[model samples]
Target: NHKENKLPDWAFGGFERPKNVNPVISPIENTKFYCPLTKDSIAWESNDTFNPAATLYNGEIVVLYRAEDKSGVGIGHRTSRLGYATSTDGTHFQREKTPVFYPDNDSQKELEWPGGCEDPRIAVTDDGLYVMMYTQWNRHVPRLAVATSRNLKDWTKHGPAFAKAFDGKFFNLGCKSGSILTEVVKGKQVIKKVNGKYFMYWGEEHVFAATSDDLIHWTPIVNIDGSLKKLFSPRDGYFDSHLTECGPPAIYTPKGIVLLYNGKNHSGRGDKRYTANVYAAGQALFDANDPTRFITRLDEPFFRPMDSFEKSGQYVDGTVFIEGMVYFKNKWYLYYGCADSKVGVAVYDPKRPAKADPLP
Candidate 1:
């Protein structure tokens, strides 16, 4: 039997559960969700939108989304396009006719089979300038790139933020989904003034962070859990056990910033929580001033991959990852990459939960 399957009431939408379907997806995709209005399972379709990342500018909520016709294992891998959508309320959204932004330049033309750009993470700087960090694909490799706008319409491409990793020729860094955090290391004794410091969190085979000042020049930092071997251990790490990546940008709160990350571990062969089975996906709190220090984390997953689509363990089909997150109207809206197939949303109160004092 499945272990303690719990989901949001809205997930069911009053529909009876389907039979004989694998419910859990990937072991690490912890951002499981369901369509409340349709009252049905959320699955991928040709006209589907996936890999969501969002931001707010000029009083309107702007979302940078990826659109594609289909997906599968090494089979019908078609071109992907980047599109735009808007909303006044996070619950309802409006999309543009043509993609606000697409791949056309040199760096994008050189990478991957996809026709256009994918997975956009947009951040607005303190000076009101809008910055976007995204992916450029080559048939063989996918690397990170950036775009900037004061108007959010026309953009200027900033090339390859980092190259593929070389884990002793054993692993490579296909750094894709990632986010940015801006903070000031104040009231701390250990680390000095890192104010106006920007932190870029990203993932490939593992989660990584880099520091920057103008969002143009970056200084790569070590992995959050310390070592790639300690964090991913494709050969020996145990923290997350299997494939894992960074979630959306950190949401700033009164206390600090809350970070949500994805961690996956597949079942091995002994009927352990290791064969295709993954869990331990949850959100953690970090000092807004010092992201390096852990403030709090749920002992168990705050969310889980329990949907038939989320639990099925189908390759590229089982999981929930983040595209980006936004803080709006005092609530935190999380945009997710679901089952590696489509996009979904979940909300949390930006107000700090119990245990920590209010932001000072």
Candidate 2:
């Protein structure tokens, strides 16, 4: 059904970058954000900071990002922690002196240890509480985890998003990049209520839907045939050949639900210029009424690793992993991780918006 529908030009592509090509936030080699438990500098965040998630709160853009410390057991073994920052203009940010969220020796320790907390996607509930969906990586199996914050300073961790899916069989399975679809109201993003239930679009390599009455517990949409309802998957000869992961929360638009997602271009399958596994950004439109159906997807990526910072970093192969997006100051700001080493933001000018399509 979606194949026949023609998507509007605005709803068909990637975001525009700001004139300044540099990253908005980069890892400050010696800078510090103290840990509450030890009162010492969060060494885990001393190396790199990237993969941020953002939302508008109290008239300012709040970005919660992944920070990796220099002290790991070995190379490429950094532990991740979440740090907070704020901006009124969306480009300039003032980060907090301490991490807003981290792993602890609590009930969630089992899933959060060794690899720590990673890759966050944030959303706000109707009741005014902030909900962050992140990855709890034990270095082996990365599971989707949730946490709540009232003031963006304190957090309460809710482990494993797939605990109830498939009779708990997927509780320990590898699940990452869970983006909650939110409705825009008065320019701020909030959870959408569909007849008293909330829906989320998530998954890596494929997109799937989940429902929740309370934002804490979620159940994946399972068909009568015992198969999960997958909204869409990667295309073979496209920029998103190998995998398609959820980026920021899906934006609700009059045209449809615009989901900006990150994809890894398989070297041989699509483009051969990129290394074996490099990440890029693409957009897709989903049916407003039926979140499970796809409207259309872009064949090419508009955002990819172009800058030196985006191409060379901890991930030498390159990455432009988008995890944060917010509509602030009458414009759309897209924040993303550059090669898993620094954070960057792109601008979409509201003045020169995508022209609406004429009626057929």
Candidate 3:
């Protein structure tokens, strides 16, 4: 049942950018990590480290970010692995010497080779296992993969997310970026059931919904006519003209479900004022009872590329692609990729309501 929407100015779709606009984690350019299988000091993350998935564990903030190695044919041609880092204060991080997740010569090798594992979004099961939804690219097409871990340091790959759903219809399709819905309880975000099912918002160019019972296999939400129901689409005259991607996990608030998302601008469509291929961030809200219906959305992006590192990198067009967020020390810590080559952060004050100063 849809309730009458009466969200405050900042209650539904609004966010604040922090005063500091510098990347917290930049490409090392020259650094090597030990790889056990390869038995080599691979510069595993020397090229870039971005698109991080964050969670608070054992009183520390843990970040698992997408890392690209320098030993590639070109930018993005390199193998991607997930690197681990920890921080007590959520600002300064101590990274591990080696990556935590990568491709191995297992049954998944055929899907993870060449491009390896990429962009990750994590969710914790009710039973306390860390579940990661990531991209497995063979340099030809990208598909969604799953893995589970008792501890964040080690992982067990679970193959494609849609492998058993819909008779593997979407098993080989291009699906990336999966954000599970989380409920904010006692100031902490956790994956919980709402109306008897688990929900996720995922996709690249368009947003779609999926439901799950076991949290391992997911079924895409289709309409009565048997079509994939699009949750949302790119705006025609905004920073997200090219596409709208699901960012960090959606937050379940008292007002509704708050979803922070990334929007890419096209060259000449919608609002070409921004550079083409540039990625900014926007916010949206969905009905609490029905996850498919939209409550409201921000007209403009609350976050964008403004710093030097975010403006230029492997992706010259620039990107402020947020994929990780956590509530720490009474504030919302938002971590994002800078031009697909570095990691940056933005903070939101929980004390200040979103309407304090309207965002454009």
Candidate 4:
């Protein structure tokens, strides 16, 4: 069983600064565009450029950005490409000449329908393989996809994690739009093993167990709704409220698992934008020994739609959504898809970095 832990102030939203720390590149204020990407005219605009993933390595903060280009006039949809960039300082980045990752015609059939790939969450394993978990969109249905790389420049794809029905027994309610996050438990990292083993947790809107021996092969281990419902049950009805999507790869901190997730209230609107604007960001903690268990849930939101960029406009606007997060120095850098049109950053306690807080 997991106990929900309340988040500390340091783990939540920070004060919106008047002066942008990296204003030379873009505006430093909260939710407003002051600067555009060094390459693109519309700040970080390729097509809904947001949900950034990062790894601070080799004296540079290497990043992968979700870039999209409108499909065409009649198509009424957009095509996405994963673009790469790097920064000596996390703020000012130099983009590469060309994008590094894109969809392949051969692998199209296996992914969820509609747009091919989106929203990548990157993790550099202790073994040095850069693992990226991304959203595979098809026919408007979304699922997870994995890509591995030896060096940041090169990538090889491994398709969807699983294609399970969202409601367990039912088919088609399957929209897997998030990430497969790995957390370190006790002294070792918690990997969902292959060949059928299990780590217990909540599921399908309710806490349940998902099992796998290898991270690739996942199977639902148990049902949390029936019989065992007494111990772990859904907080609301019908899995993840109206809309619940997983956040970026969770960061394992000494305090607990700093897990960030996205959730939308029951707005009952056809347009996802209305529902998205109502979306709120929340956090929880998990046990170090058993990461599947929840330590606590913050009752209030850590982030919500606030500024002009988040409340209105074109592209995927009106969403103060999170794409992924990473820890560098000593502070946590929260990477967000601002209004879904551009990618941006929010920092908490910059002085907390190792160099800033290096113990005497």
Candidate lDDT (C-alpha), each: 0.53, 0.78, 0.79, 0.51
Q: Rank the candidates by lDDT, best first.
A: 3, 2, 1, 4
In model 4, the Cα lDDT at residue 245 comes to 52
10 residues in a row with least lDDT, candidate 4? 28-37
Off by over 4 Å in 1: 1-47, 70-76, 105-107, 112-115, 163-173, 183-196, 222-239, 252-257, 269-281, 287-289, 294-297, 306-318, 350-360
Winner by TM-score: 3
lDDT of 2 by residue, 65-129 (tens): 89888777553477788888999888888887567788777888778876789999989887789
For candidate 4, write residues 127-231 as lDDT tens digits.
Answer: 666777676766465655567787777877766554332443422334344344454544233333222353323222334334444444444443466332211
187 in model 2: Cα distance from truth in Å?
Answer: 2.2
* Higher-TM-score candidate of 1 and 2: 2
Superposed by TM-score, candidate 1 places the C-alpha of residue 121 at a distance from the truth, in angstroms, of 1.7
Pairs that collide in candidate 2 are 44-68, 44-69, 45-69
Q: Arrange candidates, best TM-score first.
A: 3, 2, 4, 1
Q: How many times do residue backbones clash in model 1?
A: 26
CA lDDT of 255 in candidate 2? 79
